[PDB]
Paper text:
To prevent aggregation and migration of the nanodiscs to the air–water interface, we plunge froze the grids within 30 s of sample application. Using our TITaNS methodology, we obtained a 3.3 Å reconstruction of LFN translocating through PApore. Our reconstruction shows a loss of LFN density in the canonical binding site above the PApore. Notably, our reconstruction does not show density for residues 50–135 in the canonical folded LFN position. However, density for residues 136–250 are apparent. In addition to a loss of LFN density in the canonical binding site above the PApore, our reconstruction shows added density inside the pore lumen indicating a translocating complex. We attribute this density to unfolded LFN interacting with the benzyl rings of the PApore Φ clamp as LFN is translocating through the pore. In addition, the density for each of the PApore F427 residues was smeared in plane with the benzyl ring suggesting rotameric states moving up and down. Notably, density located at the PApore charge clamp is consistent with an α helix and suggests the deprotonated state of LF favors helix formation within the pore. Further down the pore we observe density for helix α1 emerging from the channel exit. Interestingly, the receptor binding domain did show different conformations for each protomer and indicates a degree of conformational flexibility.
Protective antigen (PA), the binding component of this AB toxin, forms an oligomeric pore that translocates lethal factor (LF) or edema factor, the active components of the toxin, into the cell. As the endosome acidifies, PAprepore undergoes a conformational change to a pore (PApore). This pore inserts into the endosomal membrane to form a channel. Three clamp sites aid in peptide translocation: the α clamp, the Φ clamp, and the charge clamp.
Residue numbers in the entry:
A (entry chain G): 277 to 735
B (entry chain A): 277 to 480
Write the structure that this text describes.
């Protein structure tokens, strides 16, 4: 865009002169009738007038013209309307570190309208990505990707229609297609682990995937943990050279399980509180193995389940229900309130109580109402957005701040008897939808009832 | 395209003056016939009038001119009317996997009017294409090809007549001419299957 200001002062000095020549003719008429006491007359007249004029003239003139001009211009090119910049991090959930990390990613609009596919350049290189780490670290800010040319001298471009669709729909997703990265190997010469720039994990990962059984487990803080364990493919003679792997041995060595009393346990929790899931090939093979073993409960025969290559075993927790992505979300009515009952002292501003770290991740927020002796609903602060009332503690006593909406002040106890109810919403009950219509009456959704105490009992 | 808005306020203060000098001649005539009960007369007259005038004048003037101007412009270059972008996937229906996949493809209009022949760049590299698989995977969205050049700093250009024919006929086909890609071989030393970047399936 550009703005132009212009001033203009014009002095116009003008001359003029003139002559004129007029020639005028004229023919007059007249009649007249006069009358007196005894005298009457009449008269007839006519006149012939010529005339001739000549007008000589001259003029001088000034003019002072002052002008102020304001102008504004907005140029645009429909092919190069917008430039993009991503703020991204790198996450290693694996087990081995990867060196010289260069992911190949993709900017995508809409359903599958791909804007661009970009390989990570030398500004975007990560030297080390150790497992259970981020690049860059979590305290630091994520990195910026804004380039297309392998030499980082050209920005990523968006045209006009995609720009309009982006500002309408706000749907811009990011895909991780493939990741480049090297292995550093040990040297027996001097002990120094050195990077081979020639070899990459691209050589190695399909070799691992085609020779192992994969097991995903989420009993450690509802987080999907994947481990691949070498197991025998019978149709491959080299693959049959491995020792046999039972399922129980695999679960023992892979997840740190134990039988402290002859019973397979993850931490202090029994294996029988976990449920098993298989894809169709692995489920068929487990069906065949249980048919041969003449057993029904799999939990009894875990030391006898022979594993094979390319198996897939999902092991979850029965108490909490999950989504399509197997993310923790919210259990049965026989689980919530069945155990969320602590003996603690009631107070103002908020509720100091200890909620189990696993259990709290399945709740989206809380609802605080007040019940009459006869029974009346006067929700303290309604709407989905103001629903979140939970916080973090330094000693383990996760707060529920009731002094959040009452003018940055405390709850209104109109009577000591007045019952103070606090409820919670499972992620499968209250949704991501925030103030769709701004009304959003919190009464119309599944609410469980955990805490219920008398105000006078509070003291 | 560009739009321009313009406002203009003009104050014009004007002066004028004048003189004039008129010289007028005039020749009048007259005849007259009078009649009574017993009295009849007649009369003849003529007149000679000179005259001379001089008009001296002066003028002052203001002018307030307010203007609002709207303008719109659409520039175009007939050789560079359109830019292209393909959304494509890679399919392996074979039996052996192929590594560092770089297909050579072709954008074609009409019957055989080839727009462009583009080798896959480093944004378009596929490290692994195992058989009975796609690059990228079917849940993900296909990849974008929009740059014929090596360092990939030039969009895929279409001129005017091809642009008109494309928006009329909607026939834009894609050919797969040849595919670059390497073999990884087994090593008897450590069991590790390693890529020879020198050899390619073109030999084989």
């Amino acid at each position: 865009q550009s703005t132009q200001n212009t001033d203009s002062q014009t002095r116009t000095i003008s001359k003029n002169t003139s002559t004129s020549r007029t020639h005028t003719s004229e023919v007059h008429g007249n009649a007249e009738v006069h009358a007196s006491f005894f005298d009457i007359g009449g008269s007839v007249s006519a006149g012939f007038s010529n005339s001739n004029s000549s007008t000589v003239a001259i003029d001088h003139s000034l003019s002072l013209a002052g002008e102020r001009t304001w102008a504004e211009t907005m140029g645009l090119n429909t092919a190069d309307t917008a430039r993009l910049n991503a703020n991204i991090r790198y996450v290693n959930t694996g087990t081995a570190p990867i060196y010289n990390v260069l992911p190949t990613t993709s900017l995508v609009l809409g359903k599958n309208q791909t804007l661009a596919t970009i390989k990570a350049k030398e500004n975007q290189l990560s030297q080390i990505l150790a497992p259970n780490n981020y690049y860059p670290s979590k305290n630091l800010a994520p990195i910026a990707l804004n380039a297309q040319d392998d030499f980082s001298s050209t920005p990523i471009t968006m045209n006009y229609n995609q720009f309009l669709e982006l500002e309408k729909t706000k749907q811009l997703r990011l895909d991780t297609d493939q990741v480049y990265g090297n292995i550093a190997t040990y040297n027996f010469e001097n002990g120094r682990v050195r990077v081979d720039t020639g070899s990459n994990w691209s050589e190695v990962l399909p070799q691992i995937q085609e020779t192992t059984a994969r097991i995903i487990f989420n009993g450690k803080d509802l987080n999907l943990v994947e481990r691949r364990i070498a197991a025998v493919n019978p149709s491959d003679p080299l693959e049959t050279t491995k020792p046999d792997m039972t399922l129980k041995e695999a679960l023992k060595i892979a997840f740190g399980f134990n039988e402290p009393n002859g019973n397979l346990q993850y931490q202090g929790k029994d294996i029988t509180e976990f449920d098993f899931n298989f894809d169709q090939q692995t489920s068929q093979n487990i069906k065949n193995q249980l048919a041969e073993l003449n057993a029904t409960n799999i939990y009894t025969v875990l030391d006898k389940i022979k594993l094979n290559a390319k198996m897939n075993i999902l092991i979850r927790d029965k108490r909490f229900h999950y989504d399509r992505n197997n993310i923790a979300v919210g259990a049965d009515e026989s689980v919530v309130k069945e155990a969320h009952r602590e003996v603690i002292n009631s107070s103002t501003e908020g509720l100091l109580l200890n909620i189990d770290k696993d259990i709290r991740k399945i709740l989206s927020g809380y609802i605080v109402e007040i019940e009459d002796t006869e029974g009346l609903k006067e929700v303290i602060n309604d709407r989905y957005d103001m629903l979140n009332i939970s916080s973090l503690r330094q000693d383990g006593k996760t707060f529920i701040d009731f002094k959040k909406y009452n003018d940055k002040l405390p709850l209104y106890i109109s009577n000591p008897n007045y019952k103070v109810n606090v409820y919670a919403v499972t992620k499968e009950n209250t949704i991501i939808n925030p103030s769709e219509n701004g009304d959003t009456s919190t009464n119309g959704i599944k609410k469980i009832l955990i805490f219920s105490k008398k105000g006078y009992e509070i003291g």
